[PDB]
Amino acid sequence: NSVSVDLPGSMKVLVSKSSNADGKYDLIATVDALELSGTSDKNNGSGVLEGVKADASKVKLTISDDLGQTTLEVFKSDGSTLVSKKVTSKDKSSTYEKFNEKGELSEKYITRADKSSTYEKFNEKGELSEKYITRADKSSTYEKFNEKGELSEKYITRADKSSTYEKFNEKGEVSEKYITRADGTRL
Numbered sequence: 001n002s003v004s005v006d007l008p009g010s011m012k013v014l015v016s017k018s019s020n021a022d023g024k025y026d027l028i029a030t031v032d033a034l035e036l037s038g039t040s041d042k043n044n045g046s047g048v049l050e051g052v053k054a055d056a057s058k059v060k061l062t063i064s065d066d067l068g069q070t071t072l073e074v075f076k077s078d079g080s081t082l083v084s085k086k087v088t089s090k091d092k093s094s095t096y097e098k099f100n101e102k103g104e105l106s107e108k109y110i111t112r113a114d115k116s117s118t119y120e121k122f123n124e125k126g127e128l129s130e131k132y133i134t135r136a137d138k139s140s141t142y143e144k145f146n147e148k149g150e151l152s153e154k155y156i157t158r159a160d161k162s163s164t165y166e167k168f169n170e171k172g173e174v175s176e177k178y179i180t181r182a183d184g185t186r187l
Contacts, residue, residue, distance in 0.1 A: 002028070
């Protein structure tokens with residue numbers, strides 16, 4: 001029968017030459033316990049697979065032609081309003097997005113090859129409300145944005161266990177500024 005192919009994002013696709021078709025390969029994959037299927041013109045497991053949840057949600061798996069990237073989209077029953085989207089590359093980096101009921105981006109979680117991560121949260125308007133960056137060196141950045149799209153809070157943490165906290169007021173200039181450095185030498 002069929003041949004198994006590994007895919008970025010810890011998934012697998014089964015590829016087998018199509019009989020009742022012509023020059024096509026049939027693809028089947030099981031993803032989060034849902035069966036997806038499609039057909040491809042190539043013999044490496046690239047191509048598009050689709051599925052349908054029992055709530056009639058549509059699931060689309062796209063595998064790029066050289067297998068370096070997979071995209072897993074979950075749509076509402078209309079087949080067009082996004083619910084979620086997971087992109088994973090071969091280098092293990094990935095972007096996961098969650099959308100609200102009308103398809104506006106609600107959360108984004110990025111992971112890089114060095115395993116730094118960036119986590120963004122959006123309001124219902126769809127604008128950036130929060131941003132949190134963790135880095136490989138163990139530094140971290142926190143940003144809170146107000147209703148006016150202005151920065152209102154920032155918190156940087158460095159590898160030497162130091163810190164810098166800042167609050168911003170109605171004017172874009174800093175109003176507070178904690179600066180912690182070597183040991184517990186505050187400011």
